[PDB]
Design a protein around this ligand. Structure first.
Ligand SMILES: NC(=O)c1ccc[n+]([C@@H]2O[C@H](COP(=O)([O-])OP(=O)(O)OC[C@H]3O[C@@H](n4cnc5c(N)ncnc54)[C@H](O)[C@@H]3O)[C@@H](O)[C@H]2O)c1
Ligand SMILES: NC(=O)c1ccc[n+]([C@@H]2O[C@H](COP(=O)([O-])OP(=O)(O)OC[C@H]3O[C@@H](n4cnc5c(N)ncnc54)[C@H](O)[C@@H]3O)[C@@H](O)[C@H]2O)c1
Lengths: 481, 481
């Protein structure tokens, strides 16, 4: 028997108790979603992403399938059972649940900026309110769930963009175009995300900035919620790649192993071969070097993947190593063997038959450092592909960018009031102010209606209706152009 | 129809390519799940938790509903479509998917230690292997998903127990029993987890040590996967509690608002009131004090909640403060107002009508410091409830306890071989060594069989049937007794 988590209990327990605590005559509760701070250096804007997936998944699909379409008695019973046995209330009140189910839709209105927009720290990006006085309580009820579902997709998108930002600049600095950047950020993180759902949301954020990923469910997530179709557009893509357990199973005859892989198993196209199973630098000096003709013969690219050592020292060289190959580093050594071309900016790019990827403990600062030292050696940034892992995408909180749902506005017996402690007060809008986006708050309903044409927040969901349906392609256009 | 993420594509992209890479005649792959290191100080053991949930959710239900019970052609086509348009293969080989579907079950054997067991760092807790040679590739394939799903529930379960370990120990020292500890750890973290699924996994981990939670989905998760039932056992419990937005809506006549909350809205039972919306110490010194008789007349408890300042200094006092109230802190001031009882060992316990809860930026170290500084002034540790939030449960990685899944053993054309990079080699077992769980590795099948008796890993899932079905009550008794 399939277990249904009631749509009316996807919250903190105390959310259930707030309805009775509001003042009598409360008709409206209005709350905003804001990144209040940044804990990541050089990042003062966040990449708005994730509202549509949450709205389609939970407010439309989940509530319709598991609440509104079901018998009224069943949703009432499921709510009463949990309240009765967890709050020790002998006879829980569910008349409001009855009334919501009889209404037949969620009486809320959600506005949000376009997904893909850069939002400065301390500028709200989404608002939610109730559209019928009787359900003043619904807004606050949903807050927990919304926060639970939308802070990770934005965080990942933002972090992903930072890599992208670095990689774009260096590309323009060292190549003069960014054509290779889409594949330079490669999601490796799925095994280290905390759940398949978190995997999907984080990986979708990654796919806003890059097309390279190993997180298959992220590609399909964009198919499910952002109208993507892999048959018509590059959502994500990846390459055949070996792994340490397979490398160890095949044995120590690394010449024959590599030769079989690149001449027989993958005679053409891309193939990534992890090379540090037994001795990395020996593999470069003795296997790859001996395979030069075969590598140059394939219509494709053999990508070398180290998976240990210091990323910067392995890629760019260790200046204090006695050994020449260790001193030079992978990119220079592969250049020495295979050569390549010179870009319009005077930088060296590897011959397209050989390549490099590094995906162990990659961080934003290490990506920046690798690009910087490579450029100092005359090598373009596009010579390395960065495997961006769970250290980047999992190791955050919702306070990494200071996100919070805050009630800022309420109507009680027709009286407008501002909600705060001691920050945003009253109704809010975000307007183009010169070349920046600016918060406007302390608005009453009249002033807010006046500003509506200038508010870059758009109606996204009212009363069960989806009002805006963005595509992955549209969001990528907004973000990167 | 609704979007199906194919059961055969919940993995890193390169896992798809590994099948054709193994040596010819590979017949068995055997992998272990191990916490290889600890990044949390004073935590050298991990609380095994989550395997049963993952197996039930994905290995049984997801593969049955979305792969086996569906027509062969559909599951072949979905896989082919993704592989074609993401790996640039014009005709992907799906014969192995077809063969798995024809088999009708997962030819898989998973063994694990009992959930609730303390596992030392660097000792494996779970193994996985294929039961039919042709499906050697399935073990590797499942690796990613299983990791993605089982590191968080264990990590949370371990972190929660850390709090438990402290709260038990101070309880024994200050009161002489642990009767209060079950509610002293209260999960507040839902809005800050990265997804609702991660919320369920983490909160389920929290509920092994405590019964206090605001995470309703975690209680229901234990109902879904761990045979719990809130009608017959105490799975999780909570209380009515106010929030800043509610308090602000009710206005600054705080005496009237508090009095209505405790005499009319919640005349009995527990009720938590957040008291720092405008001035925390004025509320304590003016509102709570003036409500002393009403508070004492209720059949229940009023729980004061601060949500700002330094947690240690608010609870135990700021010794550098000039104001009596601030220097003494919440617990001593509440004692001055209401008094209470004195334990056998000389420690003060607040009158049962009044209480304290703190749930902002709570850490293990802060919990310990608050217990220590309360005891240093003769206050029992049971006087305050700890609201453990997303800072604790979200801000981790898989490598917080060094979790990795590594193939350690393979059979190739009948020959047993060890797998390891340059660590566990071969088949493994975990034996009790005088209440010291130790790893035994480098075992061939014969040696592993001779050790079957002393191996604490038990059969959990073989060839489609769940063989061990632990209850939440069993796990709690194993953990705490
Ligand atoms: N197609 C492919 O080749 C492919 C696909 C997927 C994964 N992979 C590989 O699998 C691994 C991915 O695993 P990942 O993304 O979880 O690791 P990661 O590379 O993102 O980071 C793991 C390392 O970062 C540090 N780290 C992580 N958590 C930390 C913490 N709390 N505190 C301090 N340091 C911490 C540690 O040094 C850790 O070893 C990688 O080795 C990847 O290359 C490869
Ligand atoms: N029944 C109830 O009263 C109830 C229930 C649920 C939640 N709540 C309240 O809602 C809030 C829960 O929020 P939470 O659990 O996500 O946060 P938390 O209270 O566990 O921690 C928040 C603080 O921890 C620090 N933090 C978080 N991430 C950080 C990071 N990357 N780096 C450095 N510091 C970081 C910060 O100081 C942050 O302000 C709390 O205020 C809680 O009291 C109350």
């Amino acid at each position: 028997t399939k277990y249904t988590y009631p749509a009316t209990l996807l919250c903190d327990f105390y959310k259930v108790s707030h309805k009775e605590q509001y003042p009598e005559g409360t008709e409206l509760i209005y709350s905003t979603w804001t990144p209040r701070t940044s804990r990541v250096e050089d990042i003062d804007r966040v990449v708005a992403f994730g509202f549509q997936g949450f709205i389609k998944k939970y407010l439309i699909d989940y509530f319709n399938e598991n609440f509104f379409k079901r018998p009224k008695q069943d949703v009432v019973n499921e709510y009463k059972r949990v309240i009765k046995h967890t709050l020790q209330v002998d006879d829980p009140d569910a008349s409001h649940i009855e009334s919501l189910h009889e209404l037949g839709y969620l009486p809320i209105k959600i506005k949000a900026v376009k997904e893909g927009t850069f939002i400065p720290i301390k500028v709200p990006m989404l608002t939610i309110e109730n559209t019928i006085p009787e359900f003043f309580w619904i807004t606050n009820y949903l807050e927990t769930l919304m926060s639970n579902e939308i802070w990770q997709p934005t965080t990942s998108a933002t972090l992903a963009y930072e890599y992208r930002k670095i990689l774009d600049e260096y590309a323009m600095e060292t190549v003069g175009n960014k054509l290779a950047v889409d594949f330079q950020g490669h999601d490796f993180s799925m095994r280290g995300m905390s759940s398949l759902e978190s995997t999907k949301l984080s990986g979708a954020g990654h796919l806003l900035s890059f097309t390279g990923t190993d997180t298959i469910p992220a590609i399909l997530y964009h198919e499910e919620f952002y109208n993507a179709n892999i048959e018509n557009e590059l959502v994500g893509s990846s390459i055949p790649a070996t792994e340490h357990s397979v490398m160890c199973a095949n044995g120590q005859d690394e010449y024959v192993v590599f030769k079989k892989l690149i001449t027989e198993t993958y005679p053409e196209g891309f193939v990534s071969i992890v090379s540090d199973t037994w001795d990395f630098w020996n593999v470069i000096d003795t296997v790859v070097r001996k395979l030069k003709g075969d590598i140059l013969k394939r219509d494709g690219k053999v990508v070398i993947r180290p998976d240990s050592g210091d990323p910067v020292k392995i890629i760019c060289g260790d200046p204090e190593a006695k050994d020449e190959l260790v001193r030079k580093g992978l990119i220079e050594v592969l250049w020495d063997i295979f050569g390549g071309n010179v870009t319009d900016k005077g930088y060296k790019v590897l011959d397209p038959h050989i390549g490099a990827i590094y995906g162990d403990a990659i961080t934003i600062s290490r990506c920046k450092e690798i690009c910087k030292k490579l450029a100092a050696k005359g090598f373009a940034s596009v010579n390395v592909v960065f495997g961006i892992g769970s250290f980047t995408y999992q190791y955050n909180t919702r306070d990494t960018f200071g996100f919070a749902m805050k009630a800022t506005y309420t109507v009680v017996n027709g009286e407008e009031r501002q909600i705060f402690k001691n920050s945003q007060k009253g109704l809010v809008a975000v307007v183009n102010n010169g070349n920046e986006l600016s918060l406007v708050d302390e608005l009453d309903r009249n002033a807010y209606k006046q500003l509506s044409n200038d508010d870059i927040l758009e109606d996204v969901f009212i009363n069960g209706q989806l009002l805006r349906n963005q595509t992955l392609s549209e969001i990528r256009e907004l973000l990167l152009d």
